[PDB]
């Protein structure tokens, strides 16, 4: 199940970033966000490969879930940059928190993409 493997890899990269966000200084964030973004890229390519075999009536819902992940990555990158802009200020930890919140949203939405695909696989069995 490459979709499950890819979702696992993406969520693991998010959990890693979330244990390193508070200790790490805001300008070592880029490699962690990059590892998350590339895990997402892998996942999206796998889902694109898988869609043609799932029932047509499920494609739209899967496609919306994919788009949500894109928007989530955008927000993560934005919050990362803000956390960088506000290092050693009065807002440093607040923007680190916002970055954390964006990464968590990404992980949750990846799990929901898996759930939608898994339901479409069930329908396909029928």
């Amino acid at each position: 199940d490459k979709v499950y493997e890819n979702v696992t890899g993406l969520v693991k990269a998010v959990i890693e970033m979330s244990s390193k966000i508070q200790p790490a200084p805001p300008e070592e964030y880029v490699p962690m966000v990059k590892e998350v973004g590339l895990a997402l890229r892998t996942l999206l390519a796998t889902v694109d490969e898988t869609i043609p075999l799932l029932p047509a009536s499920t494609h739209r819902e899967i496609e919306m879930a994919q788009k949500l992940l894109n928007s989530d990555l955008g927000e993560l990158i934005n919050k990362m940059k803000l956390a960088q802009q506000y290092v050693m200020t009065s807002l440093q930890q607040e923007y680190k928190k916002q970055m954390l919140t964006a990464a968590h949203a990404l992980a949750v939405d990846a799990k929901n993409l898996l759930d939608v695909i898994d339901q479409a696989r069930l329908k396909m069995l029928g």
Binding site: V33, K34, L38, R41, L44, L73, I77
Partner: peptide, 13 residues
């Protein structure tokens, strides 16, 4: 969705 992601990713290089 892949196109959009790949240009989002450009920002991290």
């Amino acid at each position: 969705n892949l196109x959009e992601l790949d240009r989002l990713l450009x920002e991290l290089n």
